[PDB]
From a paper:
The polyamine-binding protein AmvR regulates the multidrug efflux pump AmvA, which is pivotal for transporting polyamines, an abundant and prevalent class of amino acid-derived metabolites. AmvA abundance in vivo is transcriptionally regulated by AmvR, a TetR/AcrR-like regulator that senses cellular polyamine levels and enables the dynamic modulation of amvA expression in response to fluctuating growth conditions. The overall fold change observed in AmvR is characteristic of the TetR/AcrR family of transcription factors and consists of an all-helical regulatory domain (α1–α9). The AmvR protein can be further divided into two subdomains in each protomer: the N-terminal DNA-binding domain (DBD) and the C-terminal ligand-binding domain (LBD).
Residue numbers in the entry:
A (entry chain A): 8 to 192
B (entry chain B): 6 to 192
């Protein structure tokens, strides 16, 4: 299909050069079609940016369910983006890129909340699976654990941006580890 | 030292709490301090320099207000120290803290004062944690420094998720989620 071929075409340029490099001329050249055909398929320049982002976070989610995880503790560590595995930094960079564009773009803002809700229910599925298999304790509401876990990993990342003195950036995995043990172990 | 320099500072803090940083022009501050524009420039290198200096004083003053709040348990003091208690008197100081967070990228003066206030915030939470441990109220699971950084990172992250307008996010659980994290860490 012509459309999905241009949908893909927006993904690798998004996954590599970023959002600002995703113009109709850039993706029509990379898809090797007329620019005219790109305006035909997609309703707007922003609509394509959001739909390339949403379908790419779904891609991130899809491979994220095909990892060799020893324990459910490991799977949840990856699910929080705290492991920073080798072939996932592109997708995580685009997620962080979309975090700043939600103020200026209404399409990107829509898809960001969409990916955030899917990220939450993916962690909710992680808490309930571990509890049903004996790996995790049942201390509190699974939904509430997931929101506090998301708030902590997003909050720890923000405190790292400030260049604070005394804090170590090598302790991100350690602090995330300790909070998970207190919540589920 | 200079009573004239302190007079302009008190005017800048007065404008900062009421309206915010954008209304803190030295034209408006000089009028508030009943002086000339040239006098403000004599004591402060810029409106941004005077903005960061007045911000540090307001956060030092907010600190002093939280400590005059008659509290009993140290676990209760940790609540107002994290800003989750929702106090009417303390709303303008917390409003300016969030306002200063958005100016750290475009203002190097305010950015310096923001990290200083955050380091003083981490100091007080460390102090309150170690005080509750000496009284046997809190447990010694981990060091006070790590728990204080984790507590600051949680409240900052929880308020950020609320800004997203996410569906099913409950703003009124800020008190509940903060009460939880404190219990897992120290209680």
């Amino acid at each position: 299909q012509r459309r999905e071929m241009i949908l893909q075409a927006a993904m690798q340029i998004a996954l590599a050069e970023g959002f600002t490099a995703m113009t109709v001329r850039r993706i029509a050249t990379e898809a090797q079609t007329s620019t005219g055909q790109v305006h035909h398929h997609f309703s707007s320049a922003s609509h394509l940016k959001a739909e390339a982002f949403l379908k790419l976070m779904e891609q991130l989610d899809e491979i994220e369910q095909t990892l060799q995880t020893t324990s459910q503790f490991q799977r949840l560590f990856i699910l929080l983006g705290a492991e920073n595995i080798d072939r996932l930094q592109p997708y995580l960079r685009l997620w962080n890129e979309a975090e700043l564009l939600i103020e200026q773009d209404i399409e990107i803002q829509k898809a960001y909340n969409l990916a955030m809700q899917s990220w939450h229910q993916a962690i909710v599925q992680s808490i309930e699976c571990g509890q049903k298999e004996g790996e995790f304790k049942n201390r509190s509401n699974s939904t509430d654990i997931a929101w506090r876990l998301i708030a902590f990993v997003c909050g720890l990342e923000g405190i790292y941006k400030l260049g604070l003195q005394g804090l170590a950036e090598e302790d991100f995995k350690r602090h995330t580890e300790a909070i998970i043990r207190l919540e589920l172990l």
